[PDB]
Design a protein around this ligand. Structure first.
Ligand SMILES: Nc1ncnc2c1ncn2[C@@H]1O[C@H](COP(=O)(O)OP(=O)(O)O)[C@@H](O)[C@H]1O
Ligand SMILES: Nc1ncnc2c1ncn2[C@@H]1O[C@H](COP(=O)(O)OP(=O)(O)O)[C@@H](O)[C@H]1O
Ligand SMILES: COc1ccc(-c2nnn[nH]2)cc1
Ligand SMILES: COc1ccc(-c2nnn[nH]2)cc1
Ligand SMILES: COc1ccc(-c2nnn[nH]2)cc1
Ligand SMILES: COc1ccc(-c2nnn[nH]2)cc1
Ligand SMILES: COc1ccc(-c2nnn[nH]2)cc1
Ligand SMILES: COc1ccc(-c2nnn[nH]2)cc1
Ligand SMILES: [K+]
Ligand SMILES: [K+]
Ligand SMILES: [Mg+2]
Ligand SMILES: [Mg+2]
Lengths: 325, 325
């Protein structure tokens, strides 16, 4: 809790849209590196401010305290590093960014553990939701900016940093379907087949990074629900049907399962952090990530039949607003 | 605007649940007839109060004024009729009920016309929504009570008045699919095939009367959208898929079309009364009817693909609350 953190804790974020980054990703690495150097300490200070504002009994949890202390250590490193003048200065910063990206890889796990240890002192799940939605999405934003900058140094086909210039939703969904079906097959001996329909030929600019979190979570929920509701017929289960709708405004991905649905008693709890019928972070984090990206995650439960999950995400066309929750 | 209307205009409604009516539908016609005689003038007075509360410029529309005057005439008839003592008194009342049911058959049409003539003097569509939602659902309630009482005199198989003791959602949906496909075929030369899945064998107590309004409206929307989006391939159109989910709490009917979806610009207008892309009452009346019955009507639009409409209705099991909006 030093005075340097206090100076930028209330300072507004200078937000850049993926379009702005795509135009620079066409001298431009120096302007980009300068932005990160000045903007990342502000984002880290906003996270520290969040920990400072937690109720005392929650902030005292040594696991919560440890994540708070990790963010203070990251602010110290980001500010104590000298400014960027030449290209070798921009390159020295990339190495610090690589190190901080790895030191904070398990923050969400530690935060879930801290939340769990403090369950008896909560009483307001809406306040837990605001803290975690803001912390995890601001963390997503920091990781996206940091990873994009590292990836700008590379000349990877169909990528401008972490922006895929021709992302196919069908291919990204197919990659995670194969990943999910294998885990499900190892647990139940079988997995539902996944059919993909709609705008299967869609290709457009998109950052796959948040879809790499959302898609396995939603597929795992759909497949586990399907298997749990058909234990008496486990080698003859209904397919999971994924429809892609692509238009000028947004991308919609509907994941429809025949997994029995979300019961009426659980319906208002599934979106709370740590609520589970088996981690409990899959749905509320996916919803927060979709909101951060200018979209949404909505559920329609048909109790006794199955669930329809709608993931809506905005395009990158020079019309989109900046990412924020 | 007489003093007799003033006496009961603020008097709370004495609400009966369909379970209460089903137990009586097992001496019981006199107790039922007594209820209608004392309760219907109160419901009519609540409608008059609604017309009295309309903004002056709207209430002045001679078409709105005419519906207001029709309700005053109905209150006069309901109160000026003598009380029910013997069974022939209960039977004399049935004839007045039959006559009033017919004199008000076109109220919604006149109200739509009055709303249309006053479009330039509205400015608040949320206030139009509250008036019409309340007027049309209270009207639904009056018609349901009046029709149920007439139908109690008959011994119709699987019916206790207007309560079907073993309503099959598949059969009622099939009846209206045949009705809708014929209108659609006469307009476009072809109609989408309707497939029904889910709990196709479900049978339970239910009042079909509101489903007889909601189902043709939703089917017409699904079929018109499908044809309008496939004009270049009109004899090869995608099916409309209806799923039935029945559980202890509610009945869910999902109507999924491949009709291109509800555009982003129209999405917040489709639920307004008189909004249409071709009457404009189908969706907002269906939503109000579903809410009145303890359920809901929700839409999920996949722009460029189609729409999923979810109609949720509560069961009649001795646990349901009374109908109200
Ligand atoms: N498709 C679905 N069908 C049925 N239940 C579901 C579905 N998706 C999620 N759920 C329910 O919501 C709960 C919370 O899900 P989630 O937040 O992703 O956490 P986790 O997957 O670790 O349980 C699940 O435990 C399950 O009860
Ligand atoms: N399934 C659907 N797919 C696409 N558009 C729809 C669908 N259902 C309704 N709409 C849109 O919503 C508007 C309002 O519908 P509605 O209130 O039922 O009135 P109406 O049927 O007389 O036009 C329609 O005119 C149409 O533009
Ligand atoms: C300077 O670059 C970074 C990148 C990532 C984090 C982070 N990830 N999770 N929590 N903090 C912190 C700093
Ligand atoms: C461990 O994570 C949390 C986050 C937030 C709260 C909170 N905010 N307001 N009241 N309780 C409690 C626990
Ligand atoms: C690759 O392009 C971008 C652009 C913007 C962000 C961002 N801004 N705020 N949080 N994340 C992340 C990546
Ligand atoms: C006494 O029975 C009735 C039945 C129906 C109405 C009605 N329908 N629409 N508007 N008023 C009025 C009275
Ligand atoms: C013709 O139908 C109506 C109903 C209600 C209003 C209203 N209520 N409040 N402000 N305008 C206007 C017109
Ligand atoms: C056949 O059983 C019933 C029960 C209740 C109503 C009602 N109450 N209020 N409005 N409609 C209508 C019919
Ligand atoms: K959860
Ligand atoms: K409408
Ligand atoms: Mg999950
Ligand atoms: Mg209609």
């Amino acid at each position: 809790n030093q005075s340097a953190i206090d100076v930028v804790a209330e300072k507004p974020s200078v937000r850049l849209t993926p379009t702005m980054m795509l135009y620079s990703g066409r001298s431009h690495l120096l302007k980009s590196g300068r932005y990160l150097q000045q903007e990342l300490p502000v984002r880290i200070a906003h996270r520290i401010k969040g920990f400072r504002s937690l109720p005392f009994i929650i902030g005292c949890n040594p696991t919560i305290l440890h994540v708070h202390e990790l963010y203070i250590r990251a602010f110290q490193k980001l500010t104590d590093f000298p400014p960027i003048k030449d290209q070798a200065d921009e390159a020295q910063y990339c190495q610090l960014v690589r190190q901080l990206l790895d030191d904070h890889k398990d923050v969400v796990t530690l935060l879930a553990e801290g939340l769990r240890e403090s369950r008896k002192h909560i009483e307001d799940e809406k306040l837990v939701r605001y803290f975690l939605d803001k912390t995890l999405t601001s963390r997503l934003g920091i990781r996206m900016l940091a990873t994009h900058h590292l990836a700008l140094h590379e000349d990877k086909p169909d990528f401008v940093g972490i922006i895929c210039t021709r992302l196919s939703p069908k291919k990204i969904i197919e990659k995670w379907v194969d990943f999910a079906r294998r885990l499900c097959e190892h647990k139940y001996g079988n997995a539902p087949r996944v059919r993909i329909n709609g705008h299967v030929a869609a290709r457009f600019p998109f950052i796959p990074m948040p879809l790499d979190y959302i898609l396995p979570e939603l597929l795992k929920n759909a497949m586990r629900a399907t298997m749990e509701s058909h234990l008496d017929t486990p080698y003859n289960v209904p397919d999971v049907v994924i429809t892609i709708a692509n238009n000028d405004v947004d991308l919609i991905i509907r994941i429809s399962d025949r997994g029995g649905g979300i019961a009426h008693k659980d319906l208002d709890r599934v979106m709370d952090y740590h609520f589970t019928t088996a981690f409990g972070f899959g749905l509320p984090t996916s919803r927060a990530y979709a909101e951060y990206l200018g979209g949404s995650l909505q559920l329609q439960s048909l109790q006794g039949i199955g669930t329809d999950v709608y993931l809506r995400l905005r395009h990158i066309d020079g019309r989109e607003e900046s990412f924020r929750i």
